[PDB]
Amino acid sequence: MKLYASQTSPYARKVRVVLAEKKIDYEMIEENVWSPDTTIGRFNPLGKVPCLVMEDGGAVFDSRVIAEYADTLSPVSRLIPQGSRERLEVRCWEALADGLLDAALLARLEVTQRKESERSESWVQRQRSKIDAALTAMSTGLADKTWCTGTHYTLADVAVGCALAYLDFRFPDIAWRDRHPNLVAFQEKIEKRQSFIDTEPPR
């Protein structure tokens, strides 16, 4: 299997963490999707990473679909629970984290993909407000628990960890660590996992 990804992509980091936790071997292929020379469209018509390309040539996207499928590929470190209700809880956590990332990417892309004369203050403020709200919800949801859903590490934790680390990396001005002590304790723990250690974004 081949994973088209980048070392900075937080959605791709989620998938890489899952693959590491599951001990699934794969070839990592760094692809710059913002280059006019990108070939990602051979595999993902949406032009995005991550994209997993299977032995047979079948292409899998997006990160949620890849994560769900990877969890079935080994009995090692089950990350998505069996129960429908328990699965709901984990997948909603993942949607919350991914949604925070969607807003953060839009806020970043407003700068990287537009001339100053093409930018909107109100749009960026909207996206930054979603990030703030998502952070508050993550802190409210985690509450006093060990992990997002209680006793066990799941894809919820992976997704949240990737989101918070992305803010550390790209948005150090968003001071979530001051605001939410329970998220700080969570992140301090999760970043000690081998899967996180091995997938830190460069720079």
Ligand X SMILES: N[C@@H](CCC(=O)N[C@@H](CS(=O)O)C(=O)NCC(=O)O)C(=O)O
- Interface contacts to ligand X, rule CB under 6 A: 6, 8-12, 33, 47-50, 62-64, 98, 105
* Binds 181: which of ligand X, Mg ion, a second copy, none (CB < 5-8 Å by kind): none
The nearest distance, CB 30 to a second copy, in angstroms, is 21
Q: What whole-number distance in Å separates Cα of residue 131 and Cα of residue 119?
A: 19
87 binds, among a second copy, Mg ion, ligand X, none (CB under 5 to 8 A by kind): a second copy
By the 10 Å C-beta count (0-12 exposed, 13-18 middle, 19+ buried), 125 is classed as exposed
Query: Pick from a second copy, Mg ion, ligand X, none: which does 195 bind, CB < 5 to 8 A by kind?
Result: none
Pick 47 or 150: Cβ nearer ligand X? 47
Task: List all residues 6 or more positions away from 146 whose beta carbon is below 8 Å from its beta carbon.
Answer: none
Residue 144 Cβ vs ligand X, minimum distance, rounded to whole Å: 29
> CA–CA separation, 145 vs 89, rounded Å?
14
One character per residue 119-158, x = contact with Mg ion (rule: CB under 5 A): -------------------------------x--------
Task: Please report, as ranges, the residues that interact with a second copy according to CB under 8 A.
Answer: 41, 45-48, 59-62, 64-65, 68-69, 72, 84, 87-88, 91-92, 94-96, 99-100, 102-103, 113-115, 117-120, 122-123, 126, 129-130, 133-134, 136-137
Helix (H), strand (E) counts: the chain: 8, 4
37 vs 143 by CB, closer to Mg ion: 143
User: Angle of helix 155-170 relative to helix 181-190, nearest 10 degrees?
Assistant: 100
- Please return the burial class of 90, using the count of CB atoms within 10 Å of its CB with bins 0-12, 13-18 and 19+: buried
- CB-wise, 44 or 195, nearer to a second copy? 44
Q: How far apart are CA 181 and CA 30, in angstroms?
A: 35
Q: Does 58 interact with Mg ion (rule: CB under 5 A)?
A: no
Asked if 63 contacts 50 with a C-beta cutoff of 8 angstroms, the reply is: yes
**In the complex, least distance from residue 59 CB atom to a second copy, rounded to whole angstroms:** 8
Closest CA to 19 of 189, 194, 146: 194
Q: Given the complex with Mg ion, which of 143 and 202 has the nearer CB atom? A: 143
